[PDB]
Each structure stands twice: as C-alpha cells, then as structure tokens.
Symmetry: D2
Subunit: 116 residues, 4 copies
C-alpha cells in the first residue's frame, strides 16, 4: 500500500475510529485537487487510498478531521483539523505511513518512509 | 501579547532560531489572507504578532517554514512546512501560545490558552 | 500478543531497528524483577515478550535503550533510556501496545489498550 | 537557574498546575538519592531546584507525578508517573529545561539545553 494513515487517541488509549481523512495533490495551477478520501477503521488505519500507478511525484496534503472526532466525544478541541503536507516520490516510488496522535489541544505526527 | 509562537528543535535540544512564521486569517471568501509574520528569536519565540484590538474571533493559520530550517542544517526533511489551524476568540479575546517541537520526519504542536 | 512494543525514529523517518527493550515487574518487596527482554525487528516491533498466563496484574516497566541506538548512528543523545511505567491487567486481561517515537533530545510515548 | 521543569496539559490546553516533581541523582551504589523537589506553579514551571555549585556532572532522574494530576481531574490515566533520566554536566555546568506535555495515555518530553 503506497499510502496508509494511522490515527491514535491519546485521551482514551485507543485507535481513533471513524475519522475522516481527505488527501489532496497540488495541481499544475497551484490549487489543491482532491485525490482520495476515506475513514479510519476499527484499528485506526486507512488503507487502499491509492495505487502505485496513480501516486505520482507531487506535493500532497493529508487532512484529518480531528474536530468532528472530538466533538462526537463531547470535547471542544482547539484545532480545526490536523494536516500534513509533503513531497512524495521525488526520488522514485516509496511507501508512506502517516501517523497522528491526537489530544484536544495537541497533535503529533510522524512519517515512516520505506523503499519497496 | 495575545498570540505568541514558540519553536523547539528536538534534534539539537535547542530553541529553533530564525525560523520564518506566517500567520493568516480566513477571509469571507474562504481564502487565506496574510495577517502577520516574523522570524523566531534566539529563544525560539515570536512575540508582537498582533494586538488585542486586531485579534478578533475567526479562523487562523500559523505556518512555520520548517523545510528551510532543516535544509540550513543539512538535513533533508519530510514536510513542506508545519501548520496549525484553529479558531480563536469565538468567545472574545484570550492569550494563545502555539508551541511546536520539530524533528526532520515529525512534529508535535500544542496550544496553551490562558 | 498481550504486550507489544513499537519504536519509531523521527530523524530518519523509519522504524527503529535492533533497539534493546527490557521489561520488569514490581515484586512483592518493591524491587524491579526482570520479566522479559528482546530487540526490535526490521519493522520496529517487538512481539512475543510474554503470554496471557504469565502476564498477571502488576506494575510493569518497559525500558528502551535509546542511548545505544543514537550512539550507533553517531549522535550523542540526551536521555539514558526511555521508560514507561504502568499498572497492567488490574481490571482483567488486556492487550497493550506501547509505542515510542524517538529523537535525540526528545521522545513521545503512547499506549493502545484493547479488550480481547 | 541551572535546572527548570515545565509541564503542560494537552487535554485542557493549559499549564499543568500543582504537579509534584521529584529529582534524584544516581549515587555510587546505583541507587537513586533524593536531590530536590517541588510543585509546579500557575505557569506550569518549577524553578529554584538547585544551584550551579550543587548541580555537578552525573545522572539525574526527574519524576513527575502525573497519576495524581489526572486523578484530580477525574480521568483514569495509563502511567504511574512520567520520568526523564539523563546525564548532566559531564562537560561542566549548563542550563537545562525539561519540558513535558501530558495526556492520559501519552506523554512527550523534550530538553532545551542553552
Ligand atoms: O507522532 C507520534 C507520536 C507517538 O508517540 C507515536 C506515534 C505512532 C505510534 C504508532 C503506533 C502503532 C503503529 O502501528 C504505528 O504505525 C504507529 C506517532
Ligand atoms: O514534548 C513537547 C511537545 C510539544 O509539542 C511541546 C513541548 C514544549 C512546549 C513548550 C511551551 C512553552 C514553553 O515555555 C516551553 O519551554 C515549552 C514539548
């Protein structure tokens, strides 16, 4: 899987389930074009967003709808969303895992990049 | 100081000095309009971005040019930038500190609202 | 697997491979008794530390030898190790994932606790 | 101030106030001897733990009583405490800030050495 997203909840010590994720790619005209979307599973993971053929060099944005997640739990959170912007595949195809660890007033994110 | 930004470097254990920070506010047309900018000081801090009168309720984005910071240290980083998007002052002025802890492939951010 | 450890490297964007992990359990006399040890695999994961029968209620410490890891990469790090101390299984058996994200002067850790 | 501790709360977006902090130094017999302690202030900070003369090279542990903090807010936390173990001053005095960002099932810590 060339792009996978994993989301964890630091308040409950659980995967963050049913979180909406939207991925965009920067187009020739410098606008964000929709690329893929989905929701995290019971394991906090979102697989199957793209394929190796479609996931070309470019600048991508992964936007995680953290606000809806916290509001459904009864918490008014600080951020509107958590997003990650990165260049992908500029030295050839790679596999990317984007992980995010969420709290109401904080988030942490890391990337794991592997060469298949 | 209604809005302060503090940036720390997790590789060197130091403030992140001379990092460019741009602040935007969301305009009626769902576009990001420039609002303030600066570069962090020797303590990793950026003060004096705005005043209580100008800092009204709304949606703000703080964008930190992390890529230029790591390139200057000879490290190839993952992110194009680190950004933080939040609603402020929806219930009137407050004091906001946005902190960011940087590594080449990761960042953490928190808000201290007092 | 009742106890799994996952270790990631925030400098290189990779799993932290070959990291030593030592687990201890607090004994009746308030000393730390050795419980299990291992090293992380190529995926940054350490499985097979214990079994459901051996992993009883108690206070456990997971100690990750981050110092050796960074020194092998040429970096003199701040911490002597990263450790996590927690009570386990006090409301019945659970499955624990302890994750750590490492940098030379910082670490983050989270737990994911699931009810099998 | 050669050693300062700052503690932040990621759930409420605030300093972590009135948190107990104990500092230990490793003794010749590989035992932890008490060295300093205090509780964080309204800004989440603990100053005045030690002096330059007393703070010699060695191995120190900072232990933060996170469990009592979350219990006071009615949240059941994962960790017994958060602790940070490091070597100081091996090349003579420096100024150390140990920061910790707390959530019920997670903590992050960094050091700022200036
Ligand atoms: O920014 C952070 C901070 C942190 O403390 C942990 C993570 C990631 C944890 C993780 C846990 C289980 C996984 O399978 C996985 O891929 C990642 C990310
Ligand atoms: O492990 C982490 C993660 C993070 O996202 C932030 C911090 C520290 C924030 C901070 C905020 C205000 C201060 O004065 C200060 O010294 C530090 C530490």
């Amino acid at each position: 899987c060339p792009l996978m997203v994993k989301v964890l909840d630091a308040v409950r010590g659980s995967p963050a389930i049913n979180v909406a994720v939207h991925v965009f790619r920067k187009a020739a005209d410098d606008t964000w074009e929709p690329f893929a979307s989905g929701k995290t599973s019971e394991s906090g993971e979102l697989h199957g967003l793209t394929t190796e053929e479609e996931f070309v060099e470019g600048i991508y944005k992964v936007e995680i709808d953290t606000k809806s997640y916290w509001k459904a739990l009864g918490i008014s959170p600080f951020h509107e969303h958590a997003e990650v912007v990165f260049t992908a595949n500029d030295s050839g195809p790679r596999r990317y895992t984007i992980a995010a660890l969420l709290s109401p007033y904080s988030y942490s994110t890391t990337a794991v990049v592997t060469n298949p």
